[PDB]
């Protein structure tokens, strides 16, 4: 047997209709008990399990999967989630780390990529799978993506040692800090533009073991609650004025992800560059990420944004860059130089170095 903790934070997967809109819905364990694909009643009685503990039916062989449902309160639409919600989830995982062999987190899709990226950084030396999942359509609606997304997440966590924060949706397992949301309606909502999926499910399960990170059994789990909250993301647009950039970069901001054009470029107008220089003088750290879905930030143009206190984000998603910025700025007693060096490293599999 392998035992999982299923953390239900909210999201459409569990929502219910109220006043003509979808809102978070409690009572997950109650529903899942009634579904044979999610709970094997015979086995529960035959083994006299507790009532909190659900049991998946068996595959041919491999261990049997048991799981406990922890329903957070209040449950959230993921558009309301922030760094503090992700820290709380990491702390749940830390508190129960020794009792379970893996974790599944049900989450709204709206900020799932940010949550996966944040958790990836918060869970240092992670040894066990932490699989986020969600749905475009609630599990209570007959035709939905929720059933198979949740089951897949549980079976991945229950059966494979993938020591990473991942996202499981639509038969694919992505590295959490590589994903971004690309479709607001289709079941294929997420893409990992600069990395293959870690796994695919079909007639068989194919895992990219060449990509999956190695378990560091020697090192203990270190959960970083020290994540810098004063970080932001700023998307450049043509003609963005220096005065607006000045206002945006005022204290107490400590870091910003600049989402630039193409291969990492912005306007070369001197008043704008002067505001970036001024911010650097104040100690602000800036990461240059491309607005483009695919590819990498590279130098080469006179408009390339590089310079004092600007670190290239290379091929990172903006979600990963913001999480990494929060993580690195939250580390105690480092110099600015050192913080910039850490930003330029691949710390969790989020960035490919050239």
């Amino acid at each position: 047997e392998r035992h999982l903790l299923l953390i239900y934070t909210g999201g459409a997967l569990g929502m219910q209709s109220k006043g003509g809109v979808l809102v978070p819905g409690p009572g997950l364990v109650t529903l899942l008990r009634t579904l044979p694909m999610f709970h094997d009643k015979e086995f529960a009685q035959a083994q006299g399990l507790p009532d909190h503990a659900l049991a998946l039916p068996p595959a041919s062989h491999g261990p049997r999967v048991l799981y406990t449902v922890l329903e957070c309160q209040p449950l959230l639409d993921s558009s309301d989630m922030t760094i503090d919600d992700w820290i709380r989830i990491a702390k749940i995982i830390e508190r129960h780390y020794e009792q379970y062999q893996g974790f599944v987190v049900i989450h709204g899709t709206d900020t799932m990529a940010s949550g996966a990226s944040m958790l990836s950084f918060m869970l240092e030396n992670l040894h066990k799978p932490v699989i986020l999942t969600g749905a475009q359509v609630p599990i209570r609606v007959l035709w939905n993506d929720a059933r198979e997304n949740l089951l897949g997440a549980l079976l991945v966590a229950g059966q494979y040692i993938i020591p990473e924060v991942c996202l499981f949706m639509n038969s694919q397992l992505f590295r959490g800090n590589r994903v971004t949301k690309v479709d607001s309606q289709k079941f294929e909502a997420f893409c990992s533009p600069n990395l293959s999926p870690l796994a695919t499910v079909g007639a068989d399960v194919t895992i990219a073991w060449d990509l999956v990170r190695k378990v560091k059994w020697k090192d203990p789990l270190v959960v970083h609650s020290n994540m810098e909250h004063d970080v932001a993301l700023l998307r450049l647009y043509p003609g963005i004025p220096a005065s607006l950039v000045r206002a945006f970069l005022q204290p107490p901001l400590k870091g910003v992800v600049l989402e630039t054009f193409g291969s990492g470029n912005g306007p070369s107008k001197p008043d704008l560059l002067q505001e970036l220089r001024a911010a650097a003088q104040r100690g602000l750290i800036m990461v240059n990420c491309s607005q483009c879905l695919r590819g990498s930030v590279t130098p080469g143009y006179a408009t390339s944004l590089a310079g004092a206190n600007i670190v290239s984000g290379l091929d990172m998603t903006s979600e990963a860059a913001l999480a990494k910025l929060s993580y690195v700025l939250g580390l105690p007693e480092l110099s600015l130089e050192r913080r910039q060096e850490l930003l330029a490293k691949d710390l969790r599999g989020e960035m490919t170095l050239p």
Copy 2:
């Protein structure tokens, strides 16, 4: 014969290396004269054409294509381009509208989607093709995408009546106000996520005539130089503070595209909503576009951002929404209500209104 004006504004397609970086490069016509795929010298002499006028070799059939090169000064990396540059381009087109059957604009990739979207709005009642193109690699580097992009743009503009601002790249013709840049390195740099390409080139040329907009021969070209400059784009991120939104939405801003999560949703924390309400009270107009590449802003969640002075952008790209905002806010003597109604219409083929 069909005659085209080729407007060279800058971009990597024409850049040269200086001090280890790419910068705009002058002298386009001089290079193109020397290239048989771009200039048929025999025909030029045989017909004694001017020296400014280049001539493409014959294509399979159809009219022969002649073109004149107008090289802007100064030439720009497109990351430095703004509404005033796009207005200037629209004015060049207006000035020479009667003399040519179509236009090709060489432009940097970095802001090409914005430029295409802006021009789409500025050129009201457009009757002739305006094809933007560019390249990931300069035409002076041997291994490049520039040659075939420029040629294709000229052949599309020269041979088909597609009365739209389009982007041509990597054998595809997109509707200009539907494109966005998706890849910073590959030759397939652009995507039209919520609309098919208007055309594809292979062994044959396939055109989606069911999509292409109809020529309104009755109506004259009206070029809008009255585009509102004080518009912005603001991308929401988890936990974005109300104080930062407040600072961003201060006067003199007149309109903003809010790029929200998923199907059009944002934090429901009251301090943030209050800043949006306050901005609306000051007369700011807001458009709600999704951060997601594909799909549409739709109501349905309690976190759906809707309310006073917020118009849904449905399936619009953010580049289109920003252009449409600039256009609509620049129109004289309209009420805030009327401006909002216009933002909710499909004015140039940039937005699909939902199905019943």
Copy 3:
């Protein structure tokens, strides 16, 4: 309420492991009764339905869907299916046509595209949906695609009037005579390379009503049991000898789909062309389909295969071409010329004519 007949012919969707291999598995209705997504017990009792009749939970809106399971015997791995099996299925549909509003057919994936194409031709003037579906993984294996494929097929048939033989898999509804199997392991096993899907399922259901064929309420269903069995498919390969083609095209063969290279081309070596000419003289009809997954057979090269008794298959799949060949050669009392004219028409939505 709308009532469906669910015809279970076999396929991996229902298979069970025996002696270390998958083989067809009986007892479908028994399993489906125990699954709340497939059977609403409350509603069954509340309405006192029969035991053969299952009832789906309510969908968002629209009519409630009831269905009856017909389990064929013997059940087949679809690799063993032939024209006669497909004729039998068409006859089941014919026998029960008036009693149900639609049909779902559970079928193996291995020959599903051929089955869908054949049924498309056999069911002339079809007025109601006939939705084929299947699975890469059996429904009794916990982690599978079978649950959602079967449910979707039933909901599509139960809720929409799409008077076509279709294939439903992995959230997509394809025109049956436009599909081909492209992946032997992934859940996205099928593609419709030269036509959009007729429908897609996500948060919403999107249907291409401008593609869907119109119901011809005036005309009765005519089921063609007269399908020519002596048709074949021959894939050209570089250097294929004239002698082998000769042997392949011997009587009693009546028709062949030639799968040619690229835009419809073959070797121009005279000995091979002469065997094709000889076959034509004997009365064989040939259809030229491209080996390429996407695109169309078009003239333009000196190696283009065209000539006596060779009809261009344009953008047809090979499964559609073979079915259409069987159909057209089975029609009574037509000349060879007339049969060629019919092959050159779009008879069921399987072929796009140039324009």
Copy 4:
């Protein structure tokens, strides 16, 4: 400088219109001389090169590329090409092997995948790139894919040591024995369904060095002219009769690729299985390939085709399987068992073992 041999065998890339159809067109070198992208006249005079030798303009960096054009006569539409044409090409390569650093072969698209696969087997221990290319549209038509396909092939061969037979089209370099033709009209005519491209061209050139085969500098080039001609491909279709299979598998056939359904399955009707058994008794060797574009032949069904003298083709393209069959059956003095063992190995990167 690096020197290439450009072998022009025919194909649409060079065709001309005659009597309303495209036919092979001579005079390639004459055309290429007049194109600045293909020939740097200044450099030619400055260096006083021969008139047969063309010179590419300088690329960004790396060695300068010179090439000689060998125009075969007669030129062929690739639909007319056979094992003997491919052997002749291999022999051209062998004859000139020491004089050049790489080879490009202009070829028709219709049978390019078969040609690439055949050459891959014929050129044992290949140390240098052999890049096939072609076009959907002739180079003499103004709007074409030919210019950039040919240039790219020359630059890839001229600048990288990829010791494989490859196909270059539409900015991608595929492993030759992994490709198949998927589109009869679009410029993206080819796909490598079970392997990534070896390289992609965009703003930069990205090479999958993890996939590219290693140069075996110890071993000499061995060109196999001993390729078995009596091999065939047979595509199964539903209800295919035993009598037709019997006729197809008659002597003198020595090997056949059976293209089966799905994961490698066929009818289990006894009369058909008996004909396969009979062919095996006669010494015929059979390879089981899937009709499906993507995936692999795997056991698992009762209808799985396996047995005496049947080797699984796993994930091979049919073009590769046929070439490998021709190669292995052409090897002198091997037992049937040894031949089957060789068919079950990955000999050139064409097959992924489980």
